[PDB]
Amino acid sequence: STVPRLHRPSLQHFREQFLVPGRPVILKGVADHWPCMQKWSLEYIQEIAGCRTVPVEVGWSQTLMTVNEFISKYIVNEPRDVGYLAQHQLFDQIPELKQDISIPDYCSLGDGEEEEITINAWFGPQGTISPLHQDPQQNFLVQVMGRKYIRLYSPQESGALYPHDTHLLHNTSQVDVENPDLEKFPKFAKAPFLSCILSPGEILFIPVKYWHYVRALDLSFSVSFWWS
């Protein structure tokens, strides 16, 4: 079934119904009017960040290039590979971009410091795919440009997701979510999940260790906040 959408819930409501029990939710009316939502065109991104060097994941491999090169090679021209400017602390690198976002007030319910919140950018063409994986902190994933298809599996379902047994990949499923090998991973078919299409201005709360899988449906720009 679908992830529920709530408009600006109170801190106490979010705390009691979603944060403490660990249940996903989409927050509406929270990041709606952040400046990024109007300002961040390709042209703007090129104007403010075009010359800066960013890590880019291709395919698999990790390379470096300028924002301008990334846009030219992987977005506007018929790309030859899938390239993704993934999990990069762009706003520490380019503080002028911090003015276009905020830290959600709900982060202040956590047991951590705001100085410890990790803000990552996720910028890429249609077709970028995460593997199904879990992270060790809470997350608000803020959609700014385009749409993402996201599937969520509780940590209670980890057995049916066949994590990699290599310690470096223990947080990642062996299963291709959208075309699963059920002859090898038969328990995956039975595992209940939530899903959504996350659209611009929406925030997805992914509870700590919730398994998530993400596919960009369009040219996409997302900002995640990892917090505790």
Ligand X SMILES: O=C(O)c1cc(C(=O)O)c(NCCCCc2ccccc2)cn1
User: Which residue ranges make up the annotated binding site?
Assistant: 57, 84, 87, 130, 133, 135, 139, 148, 212, 226
Q: How many residues bind ligand X (CB under 6 A)?
A: 15
Task: Give the x/- contact pattern for ligand X in 62-101, rule: CB under 6 A.
Answer: --------------------x-x-x---------------
Q: How many residues bind Mn ion (CB under 5 A)?
A: 1
Rounded Cα–Cα distance for residues 134 and 113 (Å):
22
Task: Give the x/- contact pattern for ligand X in 46-65, rule: CB under 6 A.
Answer: -----------x-x------
Rounded Cα–Cα distance for residues 59 and 81 (Å):
6
Taking the complex as a whole, the smallest distance from the CB of residue 78 to Mn ion amounts, in Å, to 29
Taking the complex as a whole, the smallest distance from the CB of residue 86 to ligand X amounts, in Å, to 4
**Is residue 208 part of the contact set for Mn ion (CB under 5 A)?**
no
Edge-to-edge strands of the sheet including 211-216?
194-198, 148-153, 211-216
- The amino acid present at 49, given as its one-letter code, is A
In terms of DSSP bridges, do strands 220-227 and 61-66 run parallel, antiparallel, or are they unpaired?
unpaired
Q: Which range of residues in 121-129, 154-162, 165-173, 176-184 is near ligand X by CB under 6 A?
A: 121-129
Contact of 130 with 94, CB cutoff 8 Å: no
Q: Would you list which residues are annotated within the binding site for a protein?
A: 57, 87, 130
Rounded Cα–Cα distance for residues 169 and 206 (Å):
20
Quote the radius of gyration of the chain (alpha carbons, Å): 17
Which residue from 27, 65, 97, 141 is in contact with ligand X, where contact means CB under 6 A?
Answer: 141
**Is residue 135 part of the contact set for Mn ion (CB under 5 A)?**
yes
Taking the complex as a whole, the smallest distance from the CB of residue 40 to ligand X amounts, in Å, to 15
SS3 of 13-64: the string is: HHHHHHHCCCCCEEEECCCCCCCHHHHCCHHHHHHHHCCCEEEEEECCEEEE
Residues that bind ligand X (CB under 6 A): 57, 59, 82, 84, 86, 122, 128-130, 135, 139, 141, 214, 222, 224
